[PDB]
Amino acid sequence: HMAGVSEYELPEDPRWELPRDRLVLGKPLGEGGQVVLAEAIGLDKDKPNRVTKVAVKMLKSDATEKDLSDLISEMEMMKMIGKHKNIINLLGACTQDGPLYVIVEYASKGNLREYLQARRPPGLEYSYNPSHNPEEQLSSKDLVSCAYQVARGMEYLASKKCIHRDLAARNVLVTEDNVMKIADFGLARDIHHIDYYKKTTNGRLPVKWMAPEALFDRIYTHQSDVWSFGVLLWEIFTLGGSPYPGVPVEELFKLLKEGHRMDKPSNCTNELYMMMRDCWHAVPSQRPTFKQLVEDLDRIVALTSNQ
Numbered sequence: 001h002m003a004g005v006s007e008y009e010l011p012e013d014p015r016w017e018l019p020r021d022r023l024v025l026g027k028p029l030g031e032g033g034q035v036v037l038a039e040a041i042g043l044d045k046d047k048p049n050r051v052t053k054v055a056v057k058m059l060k061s062d063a064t065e066k067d068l069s070d071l072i073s074e075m076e077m078m079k080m081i082g083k084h085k086n087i088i089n090l091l092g093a094c095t096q097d098g099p100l101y102v103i104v105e106y107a108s109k110g111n112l113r114e115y116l117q118a119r120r121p122p123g124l125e126y127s128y129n130p131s132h133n134p135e136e137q138l139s140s141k142d143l144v145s146c147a148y149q150v151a152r153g154m155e156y157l158a159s160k161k162c163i164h165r166d167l168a169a170r171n172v173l174v175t176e177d178n179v180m181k182i183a184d185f186g187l188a189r190d191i192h193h194i195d196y197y198k199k200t201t202n203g204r205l206p207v208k209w210m211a212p213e214a215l216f217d218r219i220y221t222h223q224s225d226v227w228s229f230g231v232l233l234w235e236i237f238t239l240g241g242s243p244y245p246g247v248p249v250e251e252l253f254k255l256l257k258e259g260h261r262m263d264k265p266s267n268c269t270n271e272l273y274m275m276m277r278d279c280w281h282a283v284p285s286q287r288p289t290f291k292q293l294v295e296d297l298d299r300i301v302a303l304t305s306n307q
Helices: 065-081 112-117 140-159 212-216 222-236 249-258 270-279 290-303
Strands: 023-031 034-041 051-058 090-094 101-105 172-174 180-182
Touching (some): 023 051, 112 222, 140 222, 212 222, 222 270, 222 290
Antiparallel strands (some): 023 034, 051 101, 172 180
């Protein structure tokens, strides 16, 4: 476990520091680290009487000293990377008079995976809609536009020397205005060899988004992120589909080595599928960059129908 919060010297930053009484705790948003919904009073000094819905990150009742440094690490990392419309930005923090709170932007519509699944057409082209409360079906343009925003955010993160290392639909959140925001891009990398078998609390296997070199040699770069983006693209056009269906984790090693790739999803243009194949190129140097991906997608968004 960890020592008292007072036992440690939390990084106090006047620009982001916010009084704890200015935060009105709400319902839990995520459990891993712990996130909860909250209402901040006067986040913007220019308007101290305005309330704003935000997400509050805090450690668990059972946290290690490393967990505290990791959280701080992400906070300072977000400051470094800066702000961008397509990423979950830092809003403030509480480093005094209580536990450490890292305030970030709130995405009312949850992660992209569940977002899409809830908007699956009754048709046959997709799996059955899991959501008990279906939503309006997205247009063809909406999906490509969704890919554009994600690639847009990654392009920015790439220009900031930031390597996500786990880009996936689950790691992309949707705002109330349907804006795509990449999350968990400032997390600290573990210094202990990974367990390709470990599964997330959501029952997700990170190995399915990892590039061959990142999976076999544990090498992470912007190129490996482009690979993940290729898998993310696959998820979009499958409306929250599961990568490599019916393929065991252990089998994934051989298959990927064989140069095998996922088949084009139903209702997916060949141009968009070729983009996925280019991202899934065997040679890192041959995969396209986020800069290019943003350009092609922009061109595609303008051509793609919205009806």
